[PDB]
Amino acid sequence: GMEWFPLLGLANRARKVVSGEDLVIKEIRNARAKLVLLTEDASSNTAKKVTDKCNYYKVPYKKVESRAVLGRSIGKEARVVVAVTDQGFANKLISLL
Ligand SMILES: [K+]
């Protein structure tokens, strides 16, 4: 019931994942982000800025529990926001979240 975790890792090793608020906003603006993942513990300001951007540009977004789990899913210690730049991986992740 946590298949999204290894899948996001697969997407990252396929170089289809970018992380960090600034870089994610860049992918959204370039129409390359097909799914954005943000943590429930993101700062109020960060969550607001990112979700407003996603909604404006019609990019789907989903939230995961913590920055530890999001970071670990892609081999890092912690991440607050990431973007998946491949439609295939995005569609699969959306159905698992
Ligand atoms: K981050």
UniProtKB/Swiss-Prot annotation:
Gene null: resulting phenotype: None; has no effect on viability, growth or sporulation at low, normal or elevated temperatures.
Q: Name one Pfam family in it.
A: Ribosomal_L7Ae
Q: Does the keyword RNA-binding apply?
A: yes
InterPro entries recorded = Ribosomal_eL30-like_sf, Ribosomal_eL8-like_CS, Ribosomal_eL8/eL30/eS12/Gad45
The alphabetized UniProt keywords are: RNA-binding
One GO biological process this protein is involved in is: ribosome biogenesis
Task: Tell me the superkingdom of the source.
Answer: Bacteria
A single Gene Ontology CC term: ribonucleoprotein complex
The reply on keyword ATP-binding is: no
Can you provide one Gene Ontology molecular function annotated for this UniProt record?
RNA binding
Database matches in NCBIfam families: PRK07714.1 (NF005825)
Query: What is its biological role?
Result: RNA-binding protein that recognizes the K-turn motif present in ribosomal RNA, but also in box C/D and box C'/D' sRNAs.
Which family, according to the similarity comment? Belongs to the eukaryotic ribosomal protein eL8 family.
Q: Specify the protein name.
A: RNA-binding protein YlxQ
Q: What is the originating organism of this protein?
A: Bacillus subtilis (strain 168)
